[PDB]
């Protein structure tokens, strides 16, 4: 982790809860991360979006 | 006058943990190693750090297969 | 497969003469053409107008085959060269397309070569293959003065089933490869 390699949260796009923490390099990956992920509240996979940590 | 050395890391306690003929339970670590100095054989799994461990209750057996490497097996009891 | 003069000339005239000249005991033992590989060393397209798509369009008109990009194995300081850079074109001709290319190469191309004194007899693999290089692409009948932006030549590998240079010399010359010495 660094200024360019930031920590971030993944938010379930359906119920808006933050379910995962991870990182990316915002120089290499300037766009918000979009990833399918299991949401324990929705109890199914869901597109999760990057949200500021 | 001074030294620019003086560093060393902690010893990692690697090696075989269960020798041939030993009675192990499933999950028992058999070998701690760097890379595959020993390869998993029958009823032996391998973890992300090359750790060999028993998949079943049984008796540990070693085998040297020449160019194919040394293997660690577990024989069901 | 297409009826093509050179290919026909190989089976009808060249094979018997070779069987004669060396006395092979097996039909498979006699020198055959395996592939013609064409390579554009380029790398003048490393950066700059790294559109060598102009050259690929040219190679394809010559061979009827679309060349595949070659890329730098490693990065190089002095040639100003980073790993993975598109530096050349390479097309592997076999069978009917190989015959057709050589056919025009002998009849038309090499004659159109400037101050042509004949192919270099010494340019043989040692293992029975041959290689020659060109300065221009204008040599070929497919390419006209209009449609060409700059001068880029190529390497040509002719691969034979022959085990020796002697045998390979025999086959290639029989086909019509014009040697100076």
């Amino acid at each position: 982790a660094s200024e360019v390699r930031i920590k971030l949260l993944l938010e379930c796009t359906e119920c808006k809860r933050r379910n995962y923490a991870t990182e990316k390099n915002k120089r290499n990956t300037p766009n918000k991360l979009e990833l399918r992920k299991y949401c324990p509240w929705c109890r199914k996979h869901t597109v999760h979006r990057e949200v500021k940590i | 006058g001074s030294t620019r050395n003086g560093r060393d890391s902690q010893a990692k306690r690697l090696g075989v943990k269960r020798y041939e003929g030993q009675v192990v339970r499933a999950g028992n670590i058999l070998v701690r190693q760097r890379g595959t100095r020993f390869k998993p054989g029958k009823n032996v799994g391998m973890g992300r750090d090359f750790t060999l461990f028993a998949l079943v209750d049984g008796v540990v057996e070693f085998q040297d297969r020449g160019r194919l490497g040394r293997y660690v097996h577990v024989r069901p009891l | 497969p297409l009826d093509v003069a050179l290919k026909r000339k190989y089976y009808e005239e060249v094979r018997p003469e070779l069987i004669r000249r060396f006395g092979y005991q097996n039909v498979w033992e006699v020198p055959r053409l395996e592939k013609v590989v064409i390579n554009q060393g380029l790398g003048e397209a490393k950066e700059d107008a790294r559109i060598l798509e102009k050259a690929a369009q040219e190679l394809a008109l010559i061979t009827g085959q679309k060349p595949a990009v070659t890329r730098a194995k490693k990065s190089i300081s002095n040639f100003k060269l980073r790993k993975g850079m598109p530096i050349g074109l390479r097309v592997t001709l076999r069978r009917d397309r190989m015959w057709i290319f050589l056919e025009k190469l002998l009849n038309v191309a090499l004659p159109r070569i400037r101050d042509f004194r004949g192919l270099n007899p010494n340019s043989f693999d040692g293992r029975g293959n041959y290689n020659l290089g060109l300065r221009e692409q204008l040599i070929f009948p497919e390419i006209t003065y209009d449609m060409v932006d700059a001068l880029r030549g190529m390497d040509i590998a002719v691969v034979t089933t022959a085990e020796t240079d002697e045998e390979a010399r025999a086959l290639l010359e029989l086909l019509g490869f014009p040697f100076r010495k």
Binding site: - | G1, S2, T3, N5 | -
Partner: protein, 141 residues
């Protein structure tokens, strides 16, 4: 004088001097040899003094073979410092020599010359030595 052109490591542990020579125990080139009777670290300067003594005796003619090489760095702390603060600096190089080692050989020279040169050479060395002559025993090695 003799020392490695290059090395993997600047400094070596001191180690030990047990046993007869590992090898190098038979005349292999010349007619006569100088054999080590005692273990020692033989310095590069000792080796060179031995060499120069032999060519000086020969004047012109003969051939000397030097069969040991000082690749072991010798270490000494700067004068009047205390213990600690790291290993001393490399001051020289030594050849490890054990009993039975043929250190020098000569050729192209009479027996009287070879005996005498090797004798003088021996006086430059920190150990007892023996003069030997090539043998069938050597030849069979």
């Amino acid at each position: 004088m003799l020392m490695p052109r290059r090395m993997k490591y600047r400094k070596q542990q001191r180690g030990r001097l047990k046993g007869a020579t590992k090898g190098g125990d038979y005349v292999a080139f010349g007619d006569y040899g100088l054999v080590a009777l005692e273990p020692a670290w033989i310095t590069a300067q000792q080796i060179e003094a031995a060499r120069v003594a032999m060519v000086r005796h020969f004047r012109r003619g003969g051939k000397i073979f030097i069969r040991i090489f000082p690749d072991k760095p010798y270490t000494k702390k700067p004068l009047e410092v205390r213990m600690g603060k790291g290993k001393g600096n490399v001051e020289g190089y030594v050849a490890v020599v054990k009993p039975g080692r043929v250190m020098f050989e000569v050729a192209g020279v009479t027996e009287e010359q070879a005996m005498e040169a090797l004798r003088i050479a021996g006086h430059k060395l920190p150990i007892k030595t023996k003069i030997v002559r090539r043998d069938a025993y050597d030849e069979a090695q």
